[PDB]
């Protein structure tokens, strides 16, 4: 996260760290959506142009974390992956269309002050909240600039009008994406960055005071560049696939 700040303790208890076993390193962010399921970006797991193709046994998920590097004894929980599900129409060839994947844990994680699932949006909640100007919140242990944070970083960012998103890039933008960030004139700044991928873009419903994950950190041209915007997988638009995966393999 660039131009963000230290998260508070328990501020984002659905935050998951995707951890490579060997060598031990951070791969990506992710989120906890129930006691057995974790949501992330497909490109964190599968990206053929760079020979990235992770299998279940390659990775661990670390839940309840705050410190980036410390093993947070008695606080974090580490889970093994039973199965990875990548969107069948995840488009790694062109524009990361449908950049989404699910991970089923080998065993349920115990909830706590530091570990708790985020809600997934219904149509009405998406329709109501996904509007230009409305701010959401992004979290991660990724790069601080285009160097790595001691603790989880957080930043709030405004959703951007679809034509401005499109006009900011040469990448073909789909309905399965939205972009967020401040415009150059707006003054304030901030963005996700490398290492933040797969992490959650969340919003707090003013209707029921619940946090909803509207987006997954997907990609950007650099990080925090003027006139550029972070792009996010549109979670509601892909919810039918999420339900299908969870219904079938629950």
């Amino acid at each position: 996260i660039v131009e963000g700040s230290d998260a508070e303790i328990g501020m984002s208890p659905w935050q998951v760290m995707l951890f490579r076993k060997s060598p031990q390193e951070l791969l990506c962010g992710a989120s906890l959506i129930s006691d057995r399921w974790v949501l992330t970006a497909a490109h964190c797991l599968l990206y053929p142009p760079w020979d990235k193709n992770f299998t279940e046994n390659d990775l661990l998920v670390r839940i309840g974390k705050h410190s980036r590097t410390r093993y947070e004894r008695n606080i974090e929980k580490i889970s093994m992956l039973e199965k990875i599900y990548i969107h069948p129409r995840y488009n790694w060839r062109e524009n990361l269309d449908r950049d989404i994947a699910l991970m089923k844990l080998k065993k349920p994680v115990a909830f706590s002050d530091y570990i708790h699932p985020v809600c997934l949006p219904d149509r009405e909640t998406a329709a109501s909240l996904l509007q230009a100007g409305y701010k959401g919140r992004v979290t991660g242990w990724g790069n601080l600039k285009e160097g790595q944070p001691s603790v989880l970083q957080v930043v709030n960012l405004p959703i951007v009008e679809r034509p401005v998103c499109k006009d900011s890039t040469r990448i073909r933008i789909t309905d399965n994406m939205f972009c967020a960030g401040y415009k150059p004139d707006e003054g304030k700044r901030g963005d996700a960055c490398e290492g933040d991928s797969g992490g959650p873009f969340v919003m707090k419903s003013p209707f029921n005071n619940r946090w909803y994950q509207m987006g997954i950190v997907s990609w950007g041209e650099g990080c925090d560049r003027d006139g550029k915007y972070g792009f996010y997988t549109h979670v509601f638009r892909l919810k039918k696939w999420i339900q299908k995966v969870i219904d079938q393999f629950g």
């Binding site: 328990g10 530091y114 985020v118 809600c119 707090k204």
Partner: peptide
């Protein structure tokens, strides 16, 4: 997943975090 989106150290105790109001204020 029915207790979702309610943080033990925040909503559950009715404590606010430092910047969530910034979100609410954007929701016009």
């Amino acid at each position: 997943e029915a207790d979702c989106g309610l943080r033990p150290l925040f909503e559950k105790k009715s404590l606010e975090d430092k910047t969530e109001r910034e979100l609410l204020e954007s929701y016009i």
